[PDB]
Amino acid sequence: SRAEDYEVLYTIGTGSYGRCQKIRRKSDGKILVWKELDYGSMTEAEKQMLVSEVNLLRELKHPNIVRYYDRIIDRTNTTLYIVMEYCEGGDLASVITKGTKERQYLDEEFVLRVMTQLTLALKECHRRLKPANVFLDGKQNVKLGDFVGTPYYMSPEQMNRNEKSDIWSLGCLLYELCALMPPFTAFSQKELAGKIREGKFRRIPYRYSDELNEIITRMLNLKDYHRPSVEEILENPLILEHHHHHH
Ligand SMILES: N#Cc1nc(Nc2ccccc2)nc2[nH]cnc12
User: Fold this and answer.
1) How far is the CA of 76 from the centre of ligand 1 (A)?
2) Binding residues for ATP, per the UniProt record?
């Protein structure tokens, strides 16, 4: 409830809203993180918005969604700390970078794990997305977290004016995991939007099964109503028990 109940171990990374720090909970020694949000220049209406968003994250409990634990206020520095689960395997952006630099494609079994567990995370989100926002724990489990950049994962419909848009994004992510590059690449957003609207891309590398290529390709269909639902994804014969989470 107070920042003094935790000890900062070190800064994991400085993100958009502030730092992500690895912390230790004094009571039991539990390793967590917290995100540092400088609410200094808010904004009573904005602060109410933030409190409500924090509430609904407080209620999002799922093995494939980064767990919320606590929120702490420290007026001495205009900083709100969001205490969350620590994912010791890091984010997927780093996995993709490691693959690119070491010129080593990822195992199809890993891609099926990501597909399975992120589809389940999305199922929960729809009930109740890029490599940097997807984390691995220590037991092979996958957890969904949360102007200069290129919207590589932007779907055609969301580019004109939708849970199927999430399916398109997941397709882009799985494709990038397989090919170590996004399906649509360009140097300007006009070129990128053109490529996205045409919906053509290279097959994922041939070391990946036709079945995996087929489901990712379906997720990348230009028409949202042709992309598979979460339910249709999880029905795929590729997806087995061992691809799900395990405590
Ligand atoms: N930012 C961030 C962040 N990072 C981790 N773990 C991690 C471990 C090694 C390398 C990189 C990341 N876990 C998190 N949970 C919520 N935010 C998290």
Assistant:
1) 26
2) 12-20, 35
**Method in brief:** X-ray
Measured from the Cα of 87, ligand 1's closest atom is 13
CA distance 9 to 21: 7
Residue 10, number of CB atoms within 10 A of its CB: 7
> Does the C-beta of 137 come closer than 6 Å to ligand 1?
no
Q: Which residues are annotated as a binding site for ATP?
A: 12-20, 35
Query: CB-based burial of residue 190 (10 Å sphere; 0-12 exposed, 13-18 middle, 19+ buried)?
Result: exposed
How many whole angstroms separate alpha carbon 51 and alpha carbon 192? 36
Ligand 1 site, residue 85, Cβ cutoff 6 A: yes
Residue nearest to atom 8 of ligand 1 (CA): 90
Domains of the chain from N-terminus onward: 1-43+67-87 (3.30.200.20), 44-66+88-247 (no CATH)
Q: CA 128, 134, 135: angle at the middle one, nearest 5?
A: 110
Which residue's CA is the nearest one to ligand 1's atom 12?
90
133 lines ligand 1 (CB under 6 A): no
Element at 28 (helix H, strand E): none
Structure tokens at 212: 């995996």
Which among 24, 15, 123 has a CA at the least distance from the CA of 69? 24
